[PDB]
């Protein structure tokens, strides 16, 4: 571990500094180091980890989509043969993305999930596991593509089952899990009806629980509820 010689607290401090400087690859490396210290993560630390890798992989996904679009056009009937370069460079970005996903999935498996007992941590990490198998699924084409999709589904399902038993319907982790599992259904599993049903039911059950919340909790919950409505508007 290249971070093995830095104090855990210094790694967390520098992750926060990297965030302020918009240096998300550094932020991710610092949080990987903090995870590898072996202690459980606080709520703030879990979100620092998630924010860092979501930003890194988000940029990779954006790049991969640009390149995949160029590649698909280069292969159309009538296009001029550009040679292997577009495929090669899309594969390079794809391999780097898969590497980041494998790294995050490795942290979750060694050993964040197994030590996560509280709903707020365990649901958070299982949602992450679903998210990073989803990103792998977005680029998958081989013998194990259906297994990748099912790994995402299984992680999301375990998170959903815990969230429904242990969290109120307005809990923002529960809401964000349902948002993303709904996108999984729509974009990955070819199940738009399941995606719409999940988003609508999640929204309506949250709506009915808002009356229990403080102003600050209400702001947090309605923020995610609006993303659910946004997706429903896109899909209907």
């Amino acid at each position: 571990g290249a971070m093995g010689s830095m104090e855990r607290a210094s790694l967390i401090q520098k992750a926060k500094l990297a965030e302020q400087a918009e240096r998300y690859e550094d932020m991710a490396a610092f949080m990987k180091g903090a995870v590898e210290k072996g202690e459980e993560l606080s709520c703030e630390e879990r979100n620092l980890l998630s924010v860092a890798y979501k930003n890194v992989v988000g940029g990779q996904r954006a790049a991969w989509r640009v390149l995949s679009s160029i590649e698909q056009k280069s292969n159309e009937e009538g296009s001029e043969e550009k040679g292997p370069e577009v495929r090669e460079y899309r594969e390079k970005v794809e391999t780097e993305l898969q590497g980041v996903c494998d790294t995050v999935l490795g942290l979750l498996d060694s050993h964040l999930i197994k030590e996560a007992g509280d709903a707020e941590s365990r649901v958070f990490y299982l949602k992450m596991k679903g998210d990073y198998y989803r990103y792998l699924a977005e680029v998958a084409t081989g013998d194990d593509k259906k297994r990748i999709i099912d790994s995402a589904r299984s992680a999301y399902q375990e998170a959903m089952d815990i969230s429904k038993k242990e969290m109120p319907p307005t809990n923002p982790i529960r809401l964000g899990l349902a948002l993303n599992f709904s996108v999984f259904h729509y974009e990955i599993a070819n199940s738009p009806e399941e995606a719409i049903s999940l988003a609508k039911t999640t929204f309506d059950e949250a709506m009915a629980d808002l009356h229990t919340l403080s102003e600050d909790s209400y702001k947090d919950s309605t923020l995610i509820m609006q993303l659910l409505r946004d997706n429903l508007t896109l899909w209907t």
């Binding site: 964000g176 948002l179 993303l227 946004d230």
Partner: peptide, 5 residues
């Protein structure tokens, strides 16, 4: 793309 968090 749809929203995720």
């Amino acid at each position: 793309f749809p929203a995720t968090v």
